[PDB]
Amino acid sequence: CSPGIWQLDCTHLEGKVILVAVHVASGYIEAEVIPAETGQETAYFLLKLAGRWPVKTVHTDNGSNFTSATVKAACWWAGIKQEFGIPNPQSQGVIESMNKELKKIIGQVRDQAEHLKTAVQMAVFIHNKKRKGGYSAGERIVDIIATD
Amino acid sequence: CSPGIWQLDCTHLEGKVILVAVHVASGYIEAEVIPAETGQETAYFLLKLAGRWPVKTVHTDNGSNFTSATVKAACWWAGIKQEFGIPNPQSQGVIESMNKELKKIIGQVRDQAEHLKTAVQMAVFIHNKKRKGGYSAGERIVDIIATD
Ligand SMILES: Cc1ccc(-c2c([C@H](OC(C)(C)C)C(=O)O)c(C)nc3ccccc23)cc1C
Numbered sequence: 702c703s704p705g706i707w708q709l710d711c712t713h714l715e716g717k718v719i720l721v722a723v724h725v726a727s728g729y730i731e732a733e734v735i736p737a738e739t740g741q742e743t744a745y746f747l748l749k750l751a752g753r754w755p756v757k758t759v760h761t762d763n764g765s766n767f768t769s770a771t772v773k774a775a776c777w778w779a780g781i782k783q784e785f786g787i788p789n790p791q792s793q794g795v796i797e798s799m800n801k802e803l804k805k806i807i808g809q810v811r812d813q814a815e816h817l818k819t820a821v822q823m824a825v826f827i828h829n830k831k832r833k834g835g836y837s838a839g840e841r842i843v844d845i846i847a848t849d
Numbered sequence: 850c851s852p853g854i855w856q857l858d859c860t861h862l863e864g865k866v867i868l869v870a871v872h873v874a875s876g877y878i879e880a881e882v883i884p885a886e887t888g889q890e891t892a893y894f895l896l897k898l899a900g901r902w903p904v905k906t907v908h909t910d911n912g913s914n915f916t917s918a919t920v921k922a923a924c925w926w927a928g929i930k931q932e933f934g935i936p937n938p939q940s941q942g943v944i945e946s947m948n949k950e951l952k953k954i955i956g957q958v959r960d961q962a963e964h965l966k967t968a969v970q971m972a973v974f975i976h977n978k979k980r981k982g983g984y985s986a987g988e989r990i991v992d993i994i995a996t997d
C-alpha cells in the first residue's frame with residue numbers, strides 16, 4: 702500500500718538485461734535495458750527513478766544487487782532506505798504478476814521492433830495505460846501520490 | 850496549461866548532449882545525457898517519456914530535430930501530435946526559465962560526481978522536488994494529471 706515502495710529486479714532476455722521497477726501499490730512500471738547487471742547501472746537507474754517519483758523504500762528478490770559502493774551511495778544521496786527481505790497480504794504476488802504481464806506484452810510486440818530495448822519501452826507504455834469502471838497503473842500511481 | 854504538453858530541447862556541455870523535456874504546465878523535468886543528437890536517441894527518449902506520462906503534444910525550439918523517420922515513427926506509435934512552431938501568455942518563458950534553473954543546479958553539484966550524466970540526474974532530482982505555501986514541480990505535475 703505505502704506510496705513510496707518500489708521493487709527492483711533484473712531479468713534476462715536475448716542475452717541482455719532488463720531492469721524492472723514496479724511501484725508496488727499501483728502496478729506501474731519503469732523499465733530499462735542495461736548492458737550488464739552492474740552496481741553502476743543500478744545506481745544510475747535508482748538516481749533517475751528517485752528524481753521522478755517519491756521513492757522511500759526499495760524491495761528486491763535479489764538483495765545482493767544492492768550491496769555495491771555505487772548503489773549504497775545512490776540510496777544515501779537520494780534518502781532511500783532498504784528493506785531486509787520482503788515484509789504484506791494485500792500485495793501478495795503483485796510484483797510477480799506485473800513482471801509476468803510485462804514479459805507477456807514484450808512477447809506480443811517484439812517482432813515490431815529491431816531492438817529489444819524498443820520492444821521493452823513499448824511494453825512499458827502498454828502496461829502502464831492498460832485499464833483493468835477500472836483504472837490503469839498510470840492512473841493509479843498518480844491518484845495514490847496526489848492523495849499525499 | 851494543457852496537461853499533455855511537453856517541450857523537448859537539447860543542450861551541450863562538456864562535449865556531450867543533454868536532452869531536456871519540460872512539462873510546460875508544471876515545470877517538471879525529465880532529462881538524459883545522450884551520446885549524440887540523433888533521431889534514434891530522440892525517438893527512444895520519446896517512447897520512454899510517453900510510456901510514463903500522458904504526452905499529447907511536443908513543442909521544441911528546434912523543429913528540425915523531429916523530422917527523422919525514427920522520430921516520426923515514435924510519435925505515430927505513441928499517438929503524439931506535433932505543433933508547428935510554438936502557439937500562450939501564461940507559459941511565456943517558463944521553458945526557458947526551467948532550463949536555466951536546471952543548468953544552474955547542474956553547475957552547483959557537478960563537482961560531486963565523476964560523470965556529467967550523474968550530475969544531470971542529481972540536478973533533475975533537486976529541480977523536481979524544489980518548493981517555490983508553495984509546491985514543487987513534482988507535486989504540481991501529479992495534481993494536474995490527477996485532476997484529469
Ligand atoms: C515505435 C517505434 C519507433 C521507431 C522504430 C524504429 C527503430 C527502433 O529503434 C529505435 C529508433 C526506437 C531506437 C527499433 O528498435 O526498431 C529503428 C532502429 N529504426 C527505425 C527506422 C525507421 C522507422 C522506425 C524505426 C520502431 C518502433 C517500433
Ligand SMILES: Cc1ccc(-c2c([C@H](OC(C)(C)C)C(=O)O)c(C)nc3ccccc23)cc1C
Nearest residue numbers: 741744745770771774775778961962963964967
Ligand atoms: C549520488 C551518487 C551516487 C554514486 C556515485 C558514484 C559514481 C557516479 O557514477 C554512477 C555510478 C552514478 C554512474 C559518478 O558519476 O560519480 C561513480 C562513477 N563511482 C562511485 C564509486 C563509489 C561510490 C559512488 C560512486 C556518485 C554520486 C554523486
